[PDB]
Design a protein around this ligand. Structure first.
Ligand SMILES: Cc1cccc(C(=O)N2c3cccc(O)c3NC3=C([C@@H]2c2ccc(OCc4ccccc4)cc2F)S(=O)(=O)CC(C)(C)C3)n1
Ligand SMILES: [Cl-]
Ligand SMILES: [Cl-]
Length: 560
């Protein structure tokens, strides 16, 4: 079975597509080498099409079946609730793609009679019709990158209509929110906040007598997912206590949408047929996580890797285990990869065994070390800041509906680059435009949030602890990665950012209130005469439930 078949009709944009970074004074302050920054477009879709289109081999074995049964056992503890129309409508982003049937996300959120009646009929049809493939739209996603010699083609997104998406939520939101944790336990990555996640990686690393770790990068994971994989995934969902209508909906969604179906371009033309994972449905993150974990757990047994602890976030996979020795780890890792390959998860790049935790990257991120005010070692997550910086420059120049810079500040708050560059650059702008109190959209684990920049200090304390405001003596390797990133992108040197932050810090303090709290906490790094930083009372009061429960990337999820 081919992941995809194509009619020859093009993947088309539904509007004009910017690919170049404008020459704008505000963005130019952040990043001068504007021609290094680009956004993907429709024009590179045929290149992507070529990469995601292949035959799949899958041979299942007893290790695979053993693990599956174990997961199902855990799954059968779960009792999933059916979401009400109102509840599902509330989870729809304000700017989610309109329906082809004469209503949009706004109508969904407002529970208008048109949207709601169409949603009911979609739901009833799921219950009645078990076979008819549901239509999907295929689009080229616009994402911003820095050039590296040369360019990434656009990713392809495949999604059903708004009415169907609201119905997936009713049938499956509780399931995709609750079940991965029940099944994978501590290995489910999306349950951790940043501090918890770092805690778990470090503890796991320090628990082994001789640790070895690796990341495993499946070549085009969504395309490696077979119809059997998606039906096995359904077999796990079906172990939950379900309302009968949910049980039918899942069955019908599986056969009509999840396993595959027709692809239609922005212009309504038949583009082809998908027989693999759609990027843009509710079950993608859950399904990818389960499938990845299943295959990897069985492949570990096949490779005889000892005392494995997995961390899985969709298609992202980290394994930490007990070293058997350099040669034998290399052999065992190769056997793991052949097992994965047989299970239809071949590697992009061969995995490499690693004996230093900081050398392992999970979801762009690695563990690094710094010291807090008292000189105590603190572990934190960081990443190469090249893409975050390129995207922030873009978002400075162009109004984008989702702000990666804001998500990056939240998730990488303790980092040198987030603190000195991103906070300084954006607080300066917001402060000059008097927009500090204006809420902005970002994402956390794929789900969309509306966040007030003035609540960043409380947010950051909750997610990272107070040490996020006091870190210093960063590793030489972190410092260099950052420093040399700034040279490449024509981002001013850190000393410039210190100078700018002092000025911003002062303006923030002068304003008093929540603004001044941002000044004390966010920019204490910038002054020699430091304020003593105590817990923020409002931090404990934040309702961050739902933040670090599950992954929702591609799932059309909005949280208020
Ligand atoms: C299938 C798919 C495609 C693209 C992005 C994502 C995704 O949700 N994330 C992701 C995954 C891998 C790579 C990647 O770069 C990535 N990026 C982002 C996020 C998130 C995500 C980001 C980090 C992560 O784990 C490491 C981590 C965890 C907590 C704090 C810091 C790092 C897991 C995770 F799902 S985000 O939290 O939604 C917003 C942010 C601006 C941080 C971008 N998923
Ligand atoms: Cl990013
Ligand atoms: Cl200075």
């Amino acid at each position: 079975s081919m992941s995809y078949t194509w009619t020859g009709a093009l993947i088309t944009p539904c509007a004009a597509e910017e690919s170049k970074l404008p020459i704008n004074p505000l963005s130019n302050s952040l990043l001068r080498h504007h021609n290094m920054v680009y956004a993907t477009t429709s024009r590179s879709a045929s290149l992507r099409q070529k990469k995601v289109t292949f035959d799949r081999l899958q041979v299942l074995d007893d290790h695979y079946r053993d693990v599956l049964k174990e997961m199902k056992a855990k799954a059968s503890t779960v009792k999933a609730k059916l979401l009400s129309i109102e509840e599902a409508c509330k989870l729809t982003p304000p700017h989610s793609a309109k329906s082809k049937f004469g209503y949009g996300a706004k109508d969904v959120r407002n529970l208008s009679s048109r949207a709601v009646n169409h949603i009911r009929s979609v739901w009833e049809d799921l219950l009645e019709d078990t076979e008819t493939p549901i239509d999907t739209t295929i689009m080229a996603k616009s994402e911003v990158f820095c050039v590296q010699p040369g360019r990434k083609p656009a990713r392809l997104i495949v999604f059903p209509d708004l009415g169907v998406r609201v119905c997936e939520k009713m049938a499956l939101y509780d399931v995709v929110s609750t079940l991965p944790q029940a099944v994978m336990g501590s290995s489910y990555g999306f349950q951790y906040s940043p501090k918890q996640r770092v805690e778990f990686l470090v503890n796991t690393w320090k628990s082994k007598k001789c640790p070895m770790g690796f990341s495993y990068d499946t070549r085009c994971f969504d395309s490696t997912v077979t119809e059997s994989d998606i039906r096995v995934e359904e077999s796990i969902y079906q172990c939950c206590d379900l309302a009968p209508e949910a049980r039918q909906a899942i069955r019908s969604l599986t056969e009509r949408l999840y396993i595959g179906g027709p692809l239609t371009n922005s212009k309504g033309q038949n583009c082809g047929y998908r027989r693999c994972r759609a990027s843009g449905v509710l079950t993608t993150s859950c399904g990818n996580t389960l499938t990845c974990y299943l295959k990897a757990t069985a492949a570990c047994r096949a490779a005889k890797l000892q005392d494995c602890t997995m961390l899985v976030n969709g298609d992202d996979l980290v394994v930490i285990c007990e070293s058997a020795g350099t040669q034998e780890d290399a052999a065992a890792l190769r056997a793991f990869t052949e097992a994965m390959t047989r299970y239809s998860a071949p590697p992009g790049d061969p995995p490499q065994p690693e004996y230093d935790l900081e050398l392992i990257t999970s979801c762009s991120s690695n563990v690094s070390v710094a010291h807090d005010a008292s000189g105590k070692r603190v572990y934190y997550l960081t990443r190469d800041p090249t893409t975050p910086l390129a995207r922030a420059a873009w978002e400075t120049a162009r109004h984008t509906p989702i702000n990666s810079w804001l998500g990056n500040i939240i998730m990488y708050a303790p980092t040198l680059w987030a603190r000195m560059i991103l906070m300084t650059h954006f607080f300066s702008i917001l402060l000059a435009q008097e927009q500090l109190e204006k809420a902005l959209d970002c994402q956390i684990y794929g789900a969309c949030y509306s966040i007030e920049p003035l609540d960043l200090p409380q947010i950051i304390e909750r997610l990272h602890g107070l040490s996020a405001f006091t870190l210093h003596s960063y590793s030489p390797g972190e410092i260099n990665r950052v420093a040399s990133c700034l040279r490449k992108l024509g981002v001013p040197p850190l000393r410039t950012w210190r100078h700018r932050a002092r000025s911003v810090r002062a303006k923030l303090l002068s304003q008093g209130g929540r603004a001044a709290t941002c000044g004390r906490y966010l920019f204490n790094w910038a002054v020699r005469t430091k304020l003593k930083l105590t817990p923020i009372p409002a931090a404990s009061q934040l309702d961050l439930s739902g933040w670090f429960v599950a992954g929702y990337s591609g799932g059309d999820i909005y949280h208020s």
